[PDB]
Amino acid sequence: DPVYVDIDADSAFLKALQRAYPMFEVEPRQVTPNDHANARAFSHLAIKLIEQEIDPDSTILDIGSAPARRMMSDRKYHCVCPMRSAEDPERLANYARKLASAAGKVLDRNISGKIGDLQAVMAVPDTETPTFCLHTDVSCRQRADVAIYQDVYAVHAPTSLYHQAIKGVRLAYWVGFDTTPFMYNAMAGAYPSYSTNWADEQVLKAKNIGLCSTDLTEGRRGKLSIMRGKKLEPCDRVLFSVGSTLYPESRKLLKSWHLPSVFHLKGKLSFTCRCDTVVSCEGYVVKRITMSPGLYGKTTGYAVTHHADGFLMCKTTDTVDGERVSFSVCTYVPATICDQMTGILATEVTPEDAQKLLVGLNQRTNTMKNYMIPVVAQAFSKWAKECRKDMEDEKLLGVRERTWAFKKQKTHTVYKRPDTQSIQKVQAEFDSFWSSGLSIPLRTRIKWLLS
Amino acid sequence: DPVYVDIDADSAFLKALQRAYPMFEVEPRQVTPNDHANARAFSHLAIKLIEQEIDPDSTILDIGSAPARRMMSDRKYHCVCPMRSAEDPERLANYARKLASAAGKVLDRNISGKIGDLQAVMAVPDTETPTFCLHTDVSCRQRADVAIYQDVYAVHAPTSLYHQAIKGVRLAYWVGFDTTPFMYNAMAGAYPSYSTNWADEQVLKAKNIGLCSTDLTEGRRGKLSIMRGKKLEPCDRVLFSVGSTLYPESRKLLKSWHLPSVFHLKGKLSFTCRCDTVVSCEGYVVKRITMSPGLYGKTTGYAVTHHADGFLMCKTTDTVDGERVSFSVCTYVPATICDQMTGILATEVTPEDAQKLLVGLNQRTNTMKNYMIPVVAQAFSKWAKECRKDMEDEKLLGVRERTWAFKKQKTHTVYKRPDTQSIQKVQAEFDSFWSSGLSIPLRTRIKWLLS
Amino acid sequence: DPVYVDIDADSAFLKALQRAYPMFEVEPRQVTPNDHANARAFSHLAIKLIEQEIDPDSTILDIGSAPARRMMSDRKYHCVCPMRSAEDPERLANYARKLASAAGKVLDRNISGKIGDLQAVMAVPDTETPTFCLHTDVSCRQRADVAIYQDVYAVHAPTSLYHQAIKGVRLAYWVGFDTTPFMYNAMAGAYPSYSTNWADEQVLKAKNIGLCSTDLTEGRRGKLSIMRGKKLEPCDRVLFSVGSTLYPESRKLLKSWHLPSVFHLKGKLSFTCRCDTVVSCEGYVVKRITMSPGLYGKTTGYAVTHHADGFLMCKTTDTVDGERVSFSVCTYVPATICDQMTGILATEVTPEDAQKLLVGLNQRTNTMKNYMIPVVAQAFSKWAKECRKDMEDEKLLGVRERTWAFKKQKTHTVYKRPDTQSIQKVQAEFDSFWSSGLSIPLRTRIKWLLS
Ligand SMILES: C[n+]1cn([C@@H]2O[C@H](COP(=O)(O)OP(=O)(O)OP(=O)(O)O)[C@@H](O)[C@H]2O)c2nc(N)[nH]c(=O)c21
Ligand SMILES: C[n+]1cn([C@@H]2O[C@H](COP(=O)(O)OP(=O)(O)OP(=O)(O)O)[C@@H](O)[C@H]2O)c2nc(N)[nH]c(=O)c21
Ligand SMILES: C[n+]1cn([C@@H]2O[C@H](COP(=O)(O)OP(=O)(O)OP(=O)(O)O)[C@@H](O)[C@H]2O)c2nc(N)[nH]c(=O)c21
Ligand SMILES: Nc1ncnc2c1ncn2[C@@H]1O[C@H](CSCC[C@H](N)C(=O)O)[C@@H](O)[C@H]1O
Ligand SMILES: Nc1ncnc2c1ncn2[C@@H]1O[C@H](CSCC[C@H](N)C(=O)O)[C@@H](O)[C@H]1O
Ligand SMILES: Nc1ncnc2c1ncn2[C@@H]1O[C@H](CSCC[C@H](N)C(=O)O)[C@@H](O)[C@H]1O
Ligand SMILES: [Mg+2]
Ligand SMILES: [Mg+2]
Ligand SMILES: [Mg+2]
Ligand SMILES: [Zn+2]
Ligand SMILES: [Zn+2]
Ligand SMILES: [Zn+2]
């Protein structure tokens, strides 16, 4: 009846968890000092909900699985495991160890069958078994009706979904960090409730952002090099830090999962699909996708995000490896603070006065993490100013003055308040869509572990 | 005896719901975190009331139905389902699944007959059954006495009503968002109690409205393009966001449902009709229409709206894709705030002082959503000013000075106070009024689901 | 069920210990006045956790052991003991004494076997026994599955790990002081919670750092020596003081244990490895390393540190042997103090006012040790100033001005706030990897002690 999560009983994240999963009874039971506890707790509850939603005797494809996390479940999982990351062999060895440990003490689960399939696959690397295989997403041959993607950021979404659809899958789920900041094309950012920071590779030698390192210096004027940098814009490669765990990512693949409300997959067979967000908690989301044969209706190409807390994007000035530059940074702000700043932002306010007001509101325990307070205070200060200028240059209704050129105004802050929506135009019609990789020493090690 | 709605027990919308449905006992019972909960609750109670109002052994046509929502009812529904939207196939599959799940556990409803009709229709796409068919509103052949339209915005109202009338229907209902803002021809707007925002397609790159997105820039003066925009007025296509769900709409079809108090349908057969509003709650309404054979009385062509809370329309200045422009926006204001601003608006007040007074009245929990407070403060400030000028240029009774031209004055705010009425002139006499579309893969899928 | 540590019942370090080991019940029981009690307590709890984590019937290699600390354990240890430090013979004699004392009173442990192996090794210095040998890390011949390094700072990490891996070891642990300050290349520093200070050999005659000594003088202007010092930068040799115990160290070997998240060992056999931090307490850490045969994935070469309290590096001015100079110093600051200085650092503050505010916050018992307060007050004062200048010289978005030279700015303070991360680039692919030393008088002494 109750669900247990490994967090401190005094934490303030438990209230947000209980608000996001009202159909469960959430109890804290802390056993480790893990520095990314909140993310693990959210993922655990998400899988509980998804299992509650679907029916038994249905076969489930787990794309890019970590098998040891599915071993005590009663449903029917087929784990797809290619070996492409440096962390995979340790996960496989953990699976074998946990299988061997519990082999005559637990008899409610297909333990003997799981062991048999693991040994069979170790014998011949190119066979499909009910519970385990060694292919990718586009070369597995098992047929199923449901697919699950959990923290998978390394595939192009439409191609992968088409290859699941032609095999009979009608329903899919995706669990992960919200993709909205990468649609606005920010240079660096934070997910403060989850102790997570991310940055573009070009700014890792900055000074005052969440993820960076630099040195002391006295400052020399020469630095004479004939190269022309002259231009600093975002590039493909990005670095993520979740607590103290590091992961590299690609902007193109992250953007590909920011799907519109309805879309068409037009291949040899054809499908009509829709995508909607069913859980949203302070930057972490769950998405549900359904797919149907044939072509119906028409598409517009728009994707919408609903903001329950505030979302901010702003321009900032820093030194990178000693040289002063400007670039854009993004973050999330709790709704109670946003509501309490409404009156103050009616006038022009300096950054230093906004900082003191925010500190006054925060400290009572803290509602929001202190290291982001300065950059927020700057952004609010600019936003207010840009509103006043708008009211002081009033235009005539229904008319654009384009004397034959028109001027563009400055914009240094974007601020989405609680209960507003972002909307962006993306592609909505798609028509353009194996070697073993295992080694004998690892096979011998796994065989030895099982026996 | 009590009705259950999926909302939080602490919400302030429950008081308004209880006020709008005094004949029921409304109890909150929350099971999901749905971000458009209030709209779903209002629709559920509306259907309960309509069923209470009419008598059994009457056959009901459900136009543009979602059949799974009618499956546990005891009345006799005929669901009209063409397949014209990208969301329809998923709704059909949900219907088949829910039918198969409950087939020997529920015996108070025509479950076996419903399954039989679904299979019969899948066999031959061009047959009418008691419970289900695949035609449009103007090509269904079933005869009935009542018709229901629930959240249907895609048909021209007089043509549809005439085609129901010539089949013997004498009573119809319509449930939906209030059409008044589109009669005033606003560019964008909000329904704040339902977490809903809407906008014209031409202003989706604005900065400070409910539904928009834009970018950071430094501002270049060139932007040299020889096109002459020169003119910015509303056009047909509009976008709606209900929580995080997106829907496109057409202005012409929305205006067509803003019907006068009495009207005539003059075809081969003739009818006399009247329309009145029976439920009104913070922007959501229920309308009741009766139709009778023959021609009686005379028409004027006026349609009236009664305001229980305040309604505002005003001019605002923003930047769209970097360029500064002006346009009109509309919203609703709670009656207690309107009553508490009566004394302050007797003098000239600046926008910045009005904003601080409104914040003082709001925060005690919030009576009204904070993101609309600035634009309201501006509107009130203009309205007061325009009243003072009127009192300072007094005319003579019963005389128009038209020396031979007359001048028109500025008008930047329209404000309808609680207990006033809007009135508009519209048309009141009308005299000017099929392929399958299903696919074999979907038919096979549905057949498989039923078995 | 409870674990006992030799600390005062009134100490404030017990709360931090209980926070870092939530799976235990920690009770204070003081028996000695030891001036490095906190470090010993942390090491004791770390070994308890590691033993809890792994399974029995596994053989454990203890690299650079002190055997008397393993004698009352139930697991199977093989202690590797070369004789390379001046403290080793006393540890060996203590082992022999404690073995002889308990030889018929304790029968749950392999006491008789331990004595037999000690005598056998004393007889022939070049034999391996289950419990004891006299080789180094790269010349021991025993085969095992787990390795442990406890307070070992004298080996090059990749070479040592490769030599364990080719013998079948799959899992290793490392316990020690955090290596982050030596990656930033500081000249001197402190670990204040553990009563520990360290310094470069060139600054041991300073005046106001943690570890130093100097003299009184009147000051003569001559000091004429023709040598050109002219340049003061860190060199390899460093001195550590833990309470009143002194240890010399090498910068190269300390840096070698600051390992990236994944790496490859490419020799005659090949391995893929990953490293992560599982316990972190105010400057003391535990690291866990896993190794697998074969080559999988790809590497980036980045190492990340997560900051739960604040970390500071700053420039300071002192006199060394009478001559005034400047150099860099580093330290740790508790999170509550950092959070309480957020509002004050929005403006420019002098060092003398920051010192008085910090004293006000500290004294209530002390949260932080007083001897570091002046140097912290200076650092904060500089950091604030450098932030203001950044906001006063704003650049254009996306552009570097390199008119053809660019200027570098001054940087006198680096400040990592709670919940941020450091990231550094290090090597991630490695492909480049005995005499007795005992004496007859010592052998005779040990033989006499055993009998
Ligand atoms: C695989 N993966 C996981 N995460 C997140 O980072 C956290 C670490 O995920 P993990 O896979 O490193 O956790 P592990 O299986 O080692 O078990 P644990 O250490 O006991 O939790 C997870 O909680 C995820 O939310 C991830 N985040 C990003 N950006 N990219 C990834 O590939 C990725
Ligand atoms: C079909 N439709 C529904 N709405 C409103 O938008 C909401 C979403 O309606 P929905 O049909 O998307 O809800 P669904 O059937 O998926 O079930 P739910 O997600 O569990 O509620 C409804 O509550 C309606 O009030 C709609 N609003 C507009 N503007 N246009 C539409 O066509 C339309
Ligand atoms: C062997 N060693 C130990 N330490 C730390 O310094 C402390 C003294 O370690 P110790 O080995 O001198 O303690 P001893 O075995 O004499 O027993 P005790 O005096 O009763 O505790 C330990 O608690 C370690 O944390 C050490 N610190 C450094 N820098 N270098 C070392 O080689 C080293
Ligand atoms: N094309 C592909 N098809 C299937 N899996 C892939 C893939 N490309 C990468 N992967 C796998 O995706 C995994 C992501 S990390 C593992 C995430 C896992 N589901 C969890 O919950 O912890 C990696 O193990 C990697 O091997
Ligand atoms: N001309 C027409 N006649 C009947 N239905 C139509 C129609 N044009 C569109 N529709 C249908 O109207 C529906 C509107 S969305 C479905 C609303 C449904 N009554 C509910 O309560 O959820 C779509 O399914 C669409 O297929
Ligand atoms: N190459 C090497 N291989 C194994 N041990 C070594 C070594 N070089 C130095 N050592 C040993 O490492 C020890 C470090 S001091 C002893 C630390 C001990 N593990 C404890 O907990 O107290 C010294 O005794 C020294 O003899
Ligand atoms: Mg981990
Ligand atoms: Mg929905
Ligand atoms: Mg000692
Ligand atoms: Zn497979
Ligand atoms: Zn019909
Ligand atoms: Zn040995």
| Separation in Å, CA of C398 to nearest CA in chain B | 10
Interface contact flag, B207 A411, Cβ < 8 Å:
yes
d(CA A421, CA A437) in angstroms, rounded, equals 45
| C233: CB partners within 8 A, 6+ apart | none
Neighbours of ion ligand 11 (CB under 5 A): B 128, 133, 140, 142
What kind and span of H or E run contains C305?
Answer: strand C302-306
d(CA C38, CA B154) in angstroms, rounded, equals 75
Q: Is the dihedral angle over the CA atoms A389, A392, A397, A403 positive or is it negative?
A: negative
DSSP one-letter code for B321: T
Question: Would you state the structure tokens that stand for residue C75, as one six-digit string?
Answer: 């697991």
Q: Which residues of B are annotated as a binding site for Zn(2+)?
A: 78, 128, 133, 140
CA gyration radius for chain A?
Answer: 25
- Are the C-beta atoms of residues A321 and A441 closer than 8 Å to each other? no
Question: Would you state the structure tokens that stand for residue B401, as one six-digit string?
Answer: 């000075």
The alpha carbon torsion through A379, A384, A385, A391 (nearest 10 deg) reads 150
Question: Would you state the structure tokens that stand for residue C232, as one six-digit string?
Answer: 């003061």
Tokens 């004429």 belong to C224
Residues in chain C: 451
Residues 34-63 of A with CB under 8 A from C: 35
Measured between beta carbons, which residues in chain A are less than 8 angstroms from residue B439? Answer: 293-294
d(CA A70, CA A79) in angstroms, rounded, equals 9
d(CA B6, CA B40) in angstroms, rounded, equals 8
Report the nearest atom of ligand 1 relative to the CA of A242: 6
The reply, when asked if residue A258 is annotated as ligand binding, is: no
DSSP one-letter code for B370: G
| Separation in Å, CA of A290 to nearest CA in chain B | 7
Q: How crowded is the C-beta side of B434, counted as CA atoms within 13 Å? A: 17
Burial (CB count <10 Å: 0-12, 13-18, 19+), residue A361: middle
Q: Which residues of C are annotated as a binding site for Zn(2+)?
A: 78, 128, 133, 140
d(CA A273, CA A147) in angstroms, rounded, equals 15
- Are the C-beta atoms of residues A263 and A429 closer than 8 Å to each other? yes
d(CA B122, CA C192) in angstroms, rounded, equals 79
* Nearest CB to C274; choose among A32, A87, A204: A87
Q: Is the dihedral angle over the CA atoms B330, B333, B338, B341 positive or is it negative?
A: negative
- Are the C-beta atoms of residues A306 and B243 closer than 8 Å to each other? yes
Distance of CA A35 to the CA centre of its chain: 18
Report the nearest atom of ligand 2 relative to the CA of B66: 15
| B444: CB partners within 8 A, 6+ apart | none
Resolution limit in angstroms?
Answer: 2.2
CA of C122 to the centre of ligand 12 (A): 14
CA gyration radius for chain C?
Answer: 25
- Amino acid code (one letter) for A188: A
Question: Would you state the structure tokens that stand for residue A121, as one six-digit string?
Answer: 């696959």
Measured between beta carbons, which residues in chain C are less than 8 angstroms from residue B217? Answer: 397
Report the nearest atom of ligand 6 relative to the CA of C85: 26
| Separation in Å, CA of C353 to nearest CA in chain A | 18
Measured between beta carbons, which residues in chain C are less than 8 angstroms from residue A326? Answer: 394-397
The alpha carbon torsion through C5, C6, C10, C16 (nearest 10 deg) reads -40
- Are the C-beta atoms of residues A33 and C279 closer than 8 Å to each other? yes
- Nearest partner of C265 among C304, C303, C292, C301, judged by Cα: C292
Helices then strands, counting H and E runs in chain A, come out as 11, 20
d(CA A92, CA C252) in angstroms, rounded, equals 35
User: Please, where are the H alpha helices in B219-350?
Assistant: 251-256, 335-340
d(CA B194, CA A165) in angstroms, rounded, equals 36
| B132: CB partners within 8 A, 6+ apart | B67, B78, B79, B81, B114, B117, B118, B121
Q: How was this structure determined?
A: cryo-EM
User: What angle do helix axes B111-123 and B88-101 make, rounded to 10 degrees?
Assistant: 140
- Are the C-beta atoms of residues C188 and C314 closer than 8 Å to each other? no
Start-to-end C-alpha separation, chain B: 37
Question: Would you state the structure tokens that stand for residue A332, as one six-digit string?
Answer: 């999330």
Hey, what long-range contacts does B442-448 have (CB within 8 A, 24 or more apart)? B442/A292, B442/A293, B442/A294, B442/B89, B442/B92, B443/B122, B445/A292, B445/A293, B445/B93, B446/B92, B446/B93, B446/B96, B446/B118, B446/B122, B447/B119, B447/B122
Interface contact flag, B216 C397, Cβ < 8 Å:
yes
Residues 206-235 of A with CB under 8 A from C: 207-208, 210-226, 228-233
User: Please, where are the H alpha helices in B277-425?
Assistant: 335-340, 351-362, 373-392
Residues 69-108 of A with CB under 8 A from C: 83-90, 93
User: Please, where are the H alpha helices in B318-405?
Assistant: 335-340, 351-362, 373-392
Does the annotation count A156 as an active-site position? no
Q: Does A306 touch chain B (CB under 8 A)?
A: yes
| Collapsed DSSP state (helix, strand, coil) of residue A351 | helix
